[PDB]
Amino acid sequence: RGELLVSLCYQSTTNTLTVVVLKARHLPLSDPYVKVNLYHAKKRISKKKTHVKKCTPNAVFNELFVFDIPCESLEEISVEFLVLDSERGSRNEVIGRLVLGATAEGSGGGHWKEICDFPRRQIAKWHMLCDG
Amino acid sequence: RGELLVSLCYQSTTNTLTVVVLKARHLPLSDPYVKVNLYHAKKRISKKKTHVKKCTPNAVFNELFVFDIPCESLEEISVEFLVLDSERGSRNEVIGRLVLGATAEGSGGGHWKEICDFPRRQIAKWHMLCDG
Amino acid sequence: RGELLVSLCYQSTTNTLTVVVLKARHLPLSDPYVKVNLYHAKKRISKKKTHVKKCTPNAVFNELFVFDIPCESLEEISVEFLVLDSERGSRNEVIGRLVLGATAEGSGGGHWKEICDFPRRQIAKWHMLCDG
Ligand SMILES: [Ca+2]
Ligand SMILES: [Ca+2]
Ligand SMILES: [Ca+2]
Ligand SMILES: [Ca+2]
Ligand SMILES: [Ca+2]
Ligand SMILES: [Ca+2]
Ligand SMILES: [Ca+2]
Ligand SMILES: [Ca+2]
Ligand SMILES: [Ca+2]
Ligand SMILES: [Cl-]
Ligand SMILES: [Cl-]
Ligand SMILES: [Cl-]
Ligand SMILES: [Cl-]
Ligand SMILES: [Cl-]
Ligand SMILES: [Cl-]
Ligand SMILES: [Cl-]
Ligand SMILES: [Cl-]
Ligand SMILES: [Cl-]
Ligand SMILES: [Cl-]
Ligand SMILES: [Cl-]
Ligand SMILES: [Cl-]
Ligand SMILES: [Cl-]
Ligand SMILES: [Cl-]
Ligand SMILES: [Cl-]
Ligand SMILES: [Cl-]
Ligand SMILES: [Cl-]
Ligand SMILES: [Cl-]
Ligand SMILES: [Cl-]
Ligand SMILES: [Cl-]
Ligand SMILES: [Cl-]
Ligand SMILES: [Cl-]
Ligand SMILES: [Cl-]
Ligand SMILES: [Cl-]
Ligand SMILES: [Cl-]
Ligand code: NA
Ligand code: NA
Ligand code: NA
Ligand code: NA
Ligand code: NA
Ligand code: NA
Numbered sequence: 001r002g003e004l005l006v007s008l009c010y011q012s013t014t015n016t017l018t019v020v021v022l023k024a025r026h027l028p029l030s031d032p033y034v035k036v037n038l039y040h041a042k043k044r045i046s047k048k049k050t051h052v053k054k055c056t057p058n059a060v061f062n063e064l065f066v067f068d069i070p071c072e073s074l075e076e077i078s079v080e081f082l083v084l085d086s087e088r089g090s091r092n093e094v095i096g097r098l099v100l101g102a103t104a105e106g107s108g109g110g111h112w113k114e115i116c117d118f119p120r121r122q123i124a125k126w127h128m129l130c131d132g
Numbered sequence: 133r134g135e136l137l138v139s140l141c142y143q144s145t146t147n148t149l150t151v152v153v154l155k156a157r158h159l160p161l162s163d164p165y166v167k168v169n170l171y172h173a174k175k176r177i178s179k180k181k182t183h184v185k186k187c188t189p190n191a192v193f194n195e196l197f198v199f200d201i202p203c204e205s206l207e208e209i210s211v212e213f214l215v216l217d218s219e220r221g222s223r224n225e226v227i228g229r230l231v232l233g234a235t236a237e238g239s240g241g242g243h244w245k246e247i248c249d250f251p252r253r254q255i256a257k258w259h260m261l262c263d264g
Numbered sequence: 265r266g267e268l269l270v271s272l273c274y275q276s277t278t279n280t281l282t283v284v285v286l287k288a289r290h291l292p293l294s295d296p297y298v299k300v301n302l303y304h305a306k307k308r309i310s311k312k313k314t315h316v317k318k319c320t321p322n323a324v325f326n327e328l329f330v331f332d333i334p335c336e337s338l339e340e341i342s343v344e345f346l347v348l349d350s351e352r353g354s355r356n357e358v359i360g361r362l363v364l365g366a367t368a369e370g371s372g373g374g375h376w377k378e379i380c381d382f383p384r385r386q387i388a389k390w391h392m393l394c395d396g
Binding site: 009011014018051062063064066120122 | 137139154155192194246250253254255256257258
């Protein structure tokens with residue numbers, strides 16, 4: 001399913017979280033874009049999406065987004081990244097998915113821990129994409 | 133007048149200020165670029181400009197600039213951002229303006245305070261543009 | 265030989281180094297790209313390259329790379345940047361070179377010192393390119 005490079009920074013004193021969708025590579029040619037959903041517990045509270053890159057298994061997005069965090073910490077916040085193939089005339093297929101959050105299974109888990117442990121530091125990591 | 137997303141980082145021990153013009157959105161189609169002027173008190177001491185994005189109310193610029201700061205603090209330094217419409221054959225019109233500095237009125241004010249309070253941290257914020 | 269703007273951040277607790285190739289200017293028109301080699305002592309342990317920008321003495325690359333550092337510090341690590349002209353049908357010529365490392369001669373030297381002195385801070389600097 002490929003890999004996705006993302007950078008996040010938690011502005012702890014101002015309750016914002018900045019998320020940069022940097023690049024994807026080794027995607028399963030597709031016309032990728034990335035959708036970013038922000039959840040508070042299980043409720044989606046915000047969504048963003050990048051521009052689409054045409055016909056390529058590797059795509060530089062470089063898109064920074066700013067999220068408002070409606071609570072005093074990231075404990076119940078999670079971020080969902082969806083790499084989708086833009087296709088006219090049909091529903092866009094999910095190429096891969098990545099979740100970061102306090103209970104996220106590994107990759108996503110450690111990156112989120114670091115984000116919470118180091119507020120105000122932008123941290124970037126490559127993650128393997130899962131089925132979505 | 134739209135909005136402009138910018139990130140700044142004050143390298144206090146080396147007297148440089150890095151300014152990233154990230155994106156504009158909801159611009160009043162125009163062919164936007166952004167000009168960045170740096171002032172020490174009321175004297176312009178440096179200027180930069182981005183490339184132009186063609187025919188669009190939303191534009192990803194992603195342009196980082198490095199400014200030399202000729203004094204030991206940011207107390208008398210201010211940064212002026214101008215979103216302009218590139219038009220051949222006439223003076224380019226100012227679509228909107230944003231000022232950050234110690235006496236700047238609100239948005240620009242708080243972002244600058246944070247920049248001075250947190251040297252070496254890159255901080256990004258959306259700002260409403262004013263008439264210019 | 266022109267100049268190259270690069271930003272680096274040493275994630276000291278996780279042994280990764282993030283390197284952003286931002287822009288080149290005043291290049292000697294060429295079709296520039298940048299190759300980035302990582303050395304541990306004198307052995308190349310990783311390599312990356314940007315996309316190429318066509319026919320221009322100034323080029324925005326904005327490419328972030330993540331390097332694994334196989335040791336506990338940056339003492340014996342160095343990073344080599346090569347600005348090359350992409351040319352079909354012949355070996356691509358090196359337009360300029362830049363080295364950052366503990367024993368690097370000046371520019372590269374001070375930027376690397378700052379990188380080691382300020383782990384987790386992304387630091388950006390313009391450097392003059394040398395013959396390569
Ligand atoms: Ca808190
Ligand atoms: Ca498609
Ligand atoms: Ca599926
Ligand atoms: Ca000072
Ligand atoms: Ca125009
Ligand atoms: Ca006006
Ligand atoms: Ca160490
Ligand atoms: Ca060429
Ligand atoms: Ca040579
Ligand atoms: Cl790889
Ligand atoms: Cl979607
Ligand atoms: Cl969705
Ligand atoms: Cl929503
Ligand atoms: Cl939706
Ligand atoms: Cl945003
Ligand atoms: Cl937290
Ligand atoms: Cl990584
Ligand atoms: Cl909006
Ligand atoms: Cl202008
Ligand atoms: Cl002006
Ligand atoms: Cl000037
Ligand atoms: Cl001028
Ligand atoms: Cl970009
Ligand atoms: Cl600059
Ligand atoms: Cl200050
Ligand atoms: Cl904001
Ligand atoms: Cl110059
Ligand atoms: Cl090469
Ligand atoms: Cl090489
Ligand atoms: Cl290698
Ligand atoms: Cl090689
Ligand atoms: Cl990489
Ligand atoms: Cl070190
Ligand atoms: Cl510099
Ligand atoms: Na939000
Ligand atoms: Na579709
Ligand atoms: Na300057
Ligand atoms: Na004009
Ligand atoms: Na590596
Ligand atoms: Na060649």
